[PDB]
Design a protein around this ligand. Structure first.
Ligand code: HEM
Ligand SMILES: [Zn+2]
Length: 455
């Protein structure tokens, strides 16, 4: 049988588009899903997408023999600076498979051991900065976490120090990257792309891409010319070879991968830490229990790799923050062939499906009826979690390569925060979620009272 798919309010020949005019599209899409259910059609001038919200359908959509990763309009605009990096490539570009296999060993749990000390390095700068604030002052949470994640990726990725914690105005590369990312997002909602009013926007965009390219190209060229072997991803990318060509990644592609790591990882990870902390201060019983685990486990001046792994509850809190607000909230797929989804919905080859992760994570048939509650205990038994139920890192071979990295980073950082300070929600902050490529709690601020424990 064939079921007719719901469709939200239409606005004539504008179709459903005026519904995504808002500055919070994902949140708008979730409300429609709350009204229309597990699947709905979204129609735009020339374009048709289907939105998936239930585990039942998403499960099926994640069958990689039938569906593959699609480059959404957002990723196509990002590709202007991330090029054929991992996140902005079609699965069937040869550079996708080649980079994937070369870089995979660099991102395993095991590799995390090598990154550990560099992660602690930026974490201590975080801790020492908070220790030096006057009682007077407060913390801009997502701003400080972004400072930390950029610098950790900068250092772990290509042994470069942006020194974000020691400067008012950000390092030129970061200003350009931030600006170049924002323009690429602003272009999604842009009315007349060729209008002369955007001539300066267009000009700034190319300047910022050049700033980014100059630095990363210079960094690679200098490492190559110096002829010195090192820890990081750069060395691994310069020496690592494709089994069937015998060739490593070219210098342009390596630049792409490094830009990619910065863009992909910086605000997803800091959003996670900002939402973890948001939930902790709103949920004092959970804070208490996680703070108790930090004091119990983190018995050394500075945490060890092994100690971060024993922070189970902090790991559970991060997963529950990722259930409620996955920081990269959506991912896009296409039908490889003509097919039928859920036995009711026929699909044409090439049809787009968009997985809506924050609705997937609210599937009551999976999680029960307390889906809006912050309850890390949901994750005590990982085997209790059904396949394709929890997907904040994407799917299959196109899943997040930096999942181990992001989670080690966040577990370590959050542990250290909970060990060293007590936190006050001094403004009684109302959750306001800003949407760009990622999600964050905009305007989230706290005060941290030090526990006077030395590092
Ligand atoms: C908690 C933090 C993170 C979240 C929630 C997250 C989420 C995701 C998601 C949902 C995808 C798939 C997107 C799609 O299908 O279009 C993805 C892909 C990717 N992410 Fe992450 N990510 C995080 C951290 C990081 C970090 C730290 C890095 C730095 C290495 C990174 C690098 C990448 C890359 C390279 C891809 C493309 C993988 C491929 O297609 O081969 N991510 N991520
Ligand atoms: Zn057809």
């Amino acid at each position: 049988t064939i079921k007719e798919m719901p469709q939200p309010k239409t606005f004539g020949e504008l179709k459903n588009l005026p519904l995504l005019n808002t500055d919070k599209p994902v949140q708008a899409l979730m409300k429609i899903a709350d009204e229309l259910g597990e699947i709905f059609k979204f129609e735009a001038p020339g374009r048709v997408t289907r939105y998936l919200s239930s585990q039942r359908l998403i499960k099926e959509a994640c069958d990689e023999s039938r569906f593959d990763k699609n480059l959404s309009q957002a990723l196509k605009f990002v590709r202007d600076f991330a090029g054929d990096g991992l996140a902005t490539s079609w699965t069937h570009e040869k550079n996708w498979k080649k980079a994937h296999n070369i870089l995979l060993p660099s991102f395993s749990q095991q590799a995390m051991k090598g990154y550990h000390a560099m992660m602690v390095d930026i974490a201590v700068q975080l801790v020492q900065k908070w220790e030096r604030l006057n009682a007077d002052e407060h913390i801009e949470v997502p701003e400080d976490m972004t400072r930390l994640t950029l610098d950790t990726i900068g250092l772990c990725g290509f042994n470069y120090r942006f020194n974000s914690f020691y400067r008012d105005q950000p390092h030129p590369f970061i200003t350009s990257m931030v600006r170049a990312l924002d323009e690429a997002m602003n272009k999604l909602q842009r009315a007349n792309p060729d209008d002369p009013a955007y001539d300066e926007n267009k000009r700034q965009f190319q300047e910022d891409i050049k700033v980014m390219n100059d630095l990363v190209d210079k960094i690679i060229a200098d490492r190559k010319a110096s002829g010195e072997q090192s820890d990081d991803l750069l060395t691994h990318m310069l020496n690592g070879k494709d089994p069937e060509t015998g060739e490593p990644l070219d210098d342009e592609n390596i630049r792409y991968q490094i830009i990619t790591f910065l863009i992909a990882g910086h605000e997803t990870t800091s959003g996670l830490l900002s939402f973890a902390l948001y939930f902790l201060v709103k949920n004092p019983h959970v804070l208490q229990k996680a703070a108790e685990e930090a004091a119990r486990v983190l018995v050394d001046p500075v945490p060890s790799y092994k100690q971060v792994k024993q922070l189970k509850y902090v790991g559970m809190v991060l997963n529950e923050a990722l259930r409620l607000w996955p920081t990269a909230p959506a991912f896009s797929l296409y039908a490889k062939e003509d097919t039928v989804l859920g036995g009711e919905y026929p699909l044409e080859k090439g049809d787009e499906l968009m997985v809506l992760i924050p609705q997937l994570h609210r599937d009551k048939t999976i999680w029960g009826d307390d889906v809006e509650e912050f309850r890390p205990e949901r994750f005590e038994n990982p085997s209790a979690i059904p396949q394709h139920a929890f997907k904040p890192f994407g799917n299959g071979q196109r899943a997040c390569i930096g999942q181990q990295f992001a989670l080690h980073e966040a577990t370590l950082v959050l542990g250290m925060m909970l060990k060293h300070f007590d936190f006050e929600d001094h403004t009684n902050y109302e959750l306001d979620i800003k949407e760009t490529l990622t999600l964050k709690p905009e305007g989230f601020v706290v005060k941290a009272k030090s526990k006077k424990i030395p590092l």
